[model samples]
Target: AHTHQDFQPVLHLVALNTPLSGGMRGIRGADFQCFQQARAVGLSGTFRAFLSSRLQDLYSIVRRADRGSVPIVNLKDEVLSPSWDSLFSGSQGQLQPGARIFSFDGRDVLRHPAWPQKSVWHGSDPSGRRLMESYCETWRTETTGATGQASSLLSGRLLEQKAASCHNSYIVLCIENSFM
Candidate 1:
């Protein structure tokens, strides 16, 4: 996905295709992986993972990308969804009804893995609102209140991207915000 700030730090980035299990990650750890991926691609800039904690929200982390400024795309160069405005407006029914958005390496959220069941972390409600009550334990990955949440990207019944426990392995969606 791409992020826009109108005058600075707008760039292209995506998921790191990594697993966050075995007590291996928190929101910060996932953010670091995203930064590392952008650096490895020789694309230096400010990248942030689409995650939220009790103390922070994705809105704070990502740029207030100008309405329709960013193109949520896939490796196939396909436009996923968004107007930046509509996105932040708590839109729903996009992930399942529209194109199958992919990771940085071309992995589709709905089709990739083709496994029985899997999910993606958003800490968001179906309409994209941040869910403070379920932030994977403030992204500590291990805390007294340790437990996170993700969206079930594929449910045999709908593409609504419903919520699930963040206790499983999943991927992070990263967006570039500025020039590093």
Candidate 2:
């Protein structure tokens, strides 16, 4: 009698507090907690804080590159779902070279929209300014000022990109330990 062994593929999931060098880092206390939350809640998607921090770190690393190019930041409205592309139709048709596009999870934002919301930072150009303006427009139209005015009357929360620098400065309070 001959017996055959079945072959199976192993999947490896790695988490990084900082950039990875070579080896796989074991999941520690906070990571384990995040894993537990994911498992308990059946989370199939990514978390916002984690994504934001990672993006910031990535931007920082790339900013140090020989090339001096800023990354492109994309925001997704989480309240309305089914798809986010509807919001940016024909918007990204002509992107600059070496632009890094960052996307936020709409579902995550809806579930946990920014609290103490205020105008944090504005982009450099009018287009970038339009991005911020659009956010305010949506907030006003959709939320009906239930939150508050989009200006100083609102909270003092930073967008993902702004939060990235706050994370680097170790001054961001909203982000939980799971993100670090």
Candidate 3:
């Protein structure tokens, strides 16, 4: 008997330990933030923010580079999802109940009592699509009463239903670029 399987790189996910204001500058700024944090923590791999902006969504960014189904894992090597695309297909697009989306330093961000606001900035919907005009003025200004979509784990689901004030600071979800 013979078996063959294509190789797929492991995709790592983490939250930025530091909270950032909504004036993320742009999607690039968010990406840079992810890169910076990953580098600061001595992690190898190109990382991008799990964010949506005026121009792109989470799926668009990933599909733009490569269409690969890689297993996503937290820093602790725990599987969050079996594939990138399947992440949204799961009920409410959430990581499994036991899987934790940890920070770069390996702390469970959601359950931490110190984190009064268990949320992350992600201007996207359940389908991983960007919500138009919901990116805090394209993630440029934190004023003018602009509101962005954010999410928190509610009953084990990351629901993008919070209309968060732009001025409020929140963490960001970062994903490792397996294609790179």
Candidate 4:
């Protein structure tokens, strides 16, 4: 049920526009879905969700698109990051710098938004480092007290937001491992 075209992987966003349930497919499923969603449109290169683990992240694993560093770009074709290191800091000298980032679909996830509350799942700490204690047991189970963190697309800090219960639900940020 997907179109045939070039996804042109810039950074990555599932644009699933749907929150993944921990009690369902789990974190692994989220990763799989991310890949499938991109493939549905014939997207080139490998895919990865913005989901982070205790010791690693998207950049920790797949930093390149295909054979080289793919500069993260926005929907308007604006360069967000010249490289992965620029993205690691969460803010680069690009569009909306020092604040939230555009969705993988190239739309702003703020004020004029689509997802509710703009609370996207991200198991990271205060400094935005991936948290080992978060992810609802690696985003595998949805429990009442099993708290995972999320990021706020609004309020001006995309990488920094409050922690929410896994049952509440949020969106995933899928990324590409290839360049446009």
Best by TM-score: 3
What is the lDDT for 66 in model 2? 19
With a 3 Å backbone cut-off (N, CA, C), the pairs that clash in candidate 4 are 12-174, 12-175, 13-174, 14-174, 65-177, 65-178, 135-139
Clashes of 3: 0
Q: Which ten residues in a row have the lowest lDDT in candidate 1?
A: 1-10
How high is each candidate's TM-score? 0.69, 0.21, 0.83, 0.70
lDDT agreement of model 4 with the native: 0.57
Q: Provide the lowest-lDDT 10-residue window in model 3.
A: 1-10
Model 2 per-residue lDDT tens digits across residues 16-119: 12221111121132234334443343333222222112113211211123112222222211121111221123332232233221111122221233422222
**Would you list the C-alpha lDDT of every candidate in the order shown?**
0.53, 0.22, 0.74, 0.57
Give candidates' CA RMSD values in order.
5.4, 16.0, 5.7, 4.5
User: What TM-score would you give candidate 3 relative to the actual structure?
Assistant: 0.83
- For candidate 2, list the clashing residue pairs, or say none: 78-106, 116-155, 117-155, 118-155
Total backbone collisions, model 2: 4
- Give candidate 4 misplaced runs (Cα > 4 Å): 1-10, 64-69, 75-78, 90-114, 126-129
Candidate numbers sorted by lDDT from highest down: 3, 4, 1, 2
- The runs of at least 3 residues in candidate 3 whose Cα sits more than 4 Å from the true structure, single-residue gaps closed, are 1-8, 63-68
Model 1's number of clashes is: 6
Q: Which residue pairs clash in candidate 1?
A: 9-177, 9-178, 68-83, 136-147, 136-148, 148-166
